[PDB]
Design a protein around this ligand. Sequence first.
Ligand SMILES: [Zn+2]
Ligand SMILES: [Zn+2]
Ligand SMILES: [Zn+2]
Ligand SMILES: [Zn+2]
Lengths: 179, 180
Amino acid sequence: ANENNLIWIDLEMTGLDPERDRIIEIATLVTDANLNILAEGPTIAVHQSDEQLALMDDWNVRTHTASGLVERVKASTMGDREAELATLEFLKQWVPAGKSPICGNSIGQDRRFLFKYMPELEAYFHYRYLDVSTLKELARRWKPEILDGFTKQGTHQAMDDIRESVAELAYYREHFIKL
Amino acid sequence: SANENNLIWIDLEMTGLDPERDRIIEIATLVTDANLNILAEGPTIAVHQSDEQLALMDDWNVRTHTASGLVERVKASTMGDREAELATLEFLKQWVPAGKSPICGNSIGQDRRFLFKYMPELEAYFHYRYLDVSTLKELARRWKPEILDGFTKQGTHQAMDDIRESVAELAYYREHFIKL
Ligand SMILES: [Zn+2]
Ligand SMILES: [Zn+2]
Ligand SMILES: [Zn+2]
Ligand SMILES: [Zn+2]
């Protein structure tokens, strides 16, 4: 465990509202300060009732069935707490509690779900945010040319998504950041 | 320029960090174009809250919000959550269309949590996206620590001064940390 390591996380949910929707997939990984992936955390399909899944709208049904997540959710024997604990067991081996900001894309949305369903995991992060989307939004406005250089697949698969976020930040470090 | 490309910057001050137990006590907004040129300043409003609520603030919040004079402004304010939300929207509608601008600011996800809870109409005025200036600071802190000393923050937690400072901080990074 090193206080300089960063915790990256991505979730998939049944919808956008924490009050009615639930977490259906979680993936985490740890990188050093230079974005080298040191280890992949568990990729867990979080079990939720069929009733909950039946509430998903068209976009969510199309998206989460195409990735095969829905089937994994129904067969999952790990609910929110079990997934939270498994993730914490992993993180404790690489990063001390309260040291790493939450790293990801449009990460504020994921954090809302962490606050409501996985508060212990949420508390493991430092207050700070490290949202890669900031660079994309700035480039979109100040240097659009580099936008076509990196393409997001938009498959909404937790582990592929978070690894993609790390690769995206690395891309901007080279093409948008002046070291 | 097209108003649809204008950016909405916002900063709040609260009685604490928990949306369930704390309340918004100050709100400030401003609008810039895509290149950070400030086009107009929104209202800076001390949001009225009960003395009971204020009495729940911890040491940090008491010191911080009394030093800025916010507590006194809050007690004398005649504008609660809804009134402050409506006044802010009255301003924003004059400069940016609904659902176009991402929420702009620093560690902005924290502020958004309070908007979702107490000012959902204002929260909905923003596009889904986030534009958090803190990302650049966090990257500079790890890849180019030197530039951090070139920009000093006041840390007084005054809504309008804070949001203007956030725009200035971003402009600073565009000049010293971004490769255009
Ligand atoms: Zn995802
Ligand atoms: Zn997703
Ligand atoms: Zn502030
Ligand atoms: Zn503040």
